[PDB]
Amino acid sequence: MGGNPEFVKFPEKYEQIFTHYDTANRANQTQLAKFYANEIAAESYKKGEEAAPGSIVIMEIYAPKKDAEGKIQSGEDGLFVIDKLAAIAVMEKRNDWGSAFKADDRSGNWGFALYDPEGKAKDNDLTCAQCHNPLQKQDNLFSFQKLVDYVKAHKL
Numbered sequence: 001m002g003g004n005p006e007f008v009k010f011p012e013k014y015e016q017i018f019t020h021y022d023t024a025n026r027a028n029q030t031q032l033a034k035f036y037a038n039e040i041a042a043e044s045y046k047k048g049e050e051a052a053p054g055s056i057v058i059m060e061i062y063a064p065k066k067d068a069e070g071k072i073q074s075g076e077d078g079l080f081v082i083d084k085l086a087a088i089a090v091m092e093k094r095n096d097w098g099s100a101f102k103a104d105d106r107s108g109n110w111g112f113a114l115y116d117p118e119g120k121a122k123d124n125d126l127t128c129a130q131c132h133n134p135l136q137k138q139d140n141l142f143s144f145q146k147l148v149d150y151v152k153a154h155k156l
């Protein structure tokens with residue numbers, strides 16, 4: 001199982017609590033993503049360019065509507081039309097992860113976990129940290145600039 005749900009728990013009610021800072025097609029061009037940040041993460045990126053301990057960032061991963069020939073349906077706004085939520089990806093930063101949590105599974109101090117829409121760990125063979133690791137300069141977040149831009153443009 002890619003990620004570490006033993007350490008990175010499912011953040012209950014994130015969609016009602018966290019700040020929704022972006023919606024975008026994923027770069028794979030087959031899924032739609034919505035991005036969320038908890039208060040510590042939002043305050044961190046209002047102050048600087050690194051998330052403080054306690055920061056949690058979430059990407060909801062949506063399967064798009066497709067016709068019977070597999071063609072993805074898009075709006076005139078260019079965003080894929082949502083069929084249903086497929087997965088909930090979680091990054092959580094701590095400066096004191098327990099020794100049982102192997103460093104090679106983390107991107108710096110970010111732990112990863114992938115959940116299904118019902119909050120159960122979702123089977124996968126992804127190497128989360130390995131793909132996020134080369135983005136150290138932007139705190140291992142692909143959506144870094146969208147988060148920075150959002151919290152600069154909105155009040156706490």
Ligand code: HEC
Pocket residue numbers: 002003025026027028033035057058059089090091112113114124126127128129130131132140141142143144
């Ligand atoms: C490259 C092959 C990746 C693998 C392996 C993992 N993720 Fe990642 N992630 C990737 C991209 C390109 C993006 C931006 C959205 C897009 O697809 O265009 C993301 C984003 C996230 C986020 C949102 C925060 C951010 O970095 O922008 C999270 C919370 C996240 N991904 C979690 C995550 C998990 C839990 C993974 C292993 C199960 C994982 N990712 C692997 C690329 C890649």
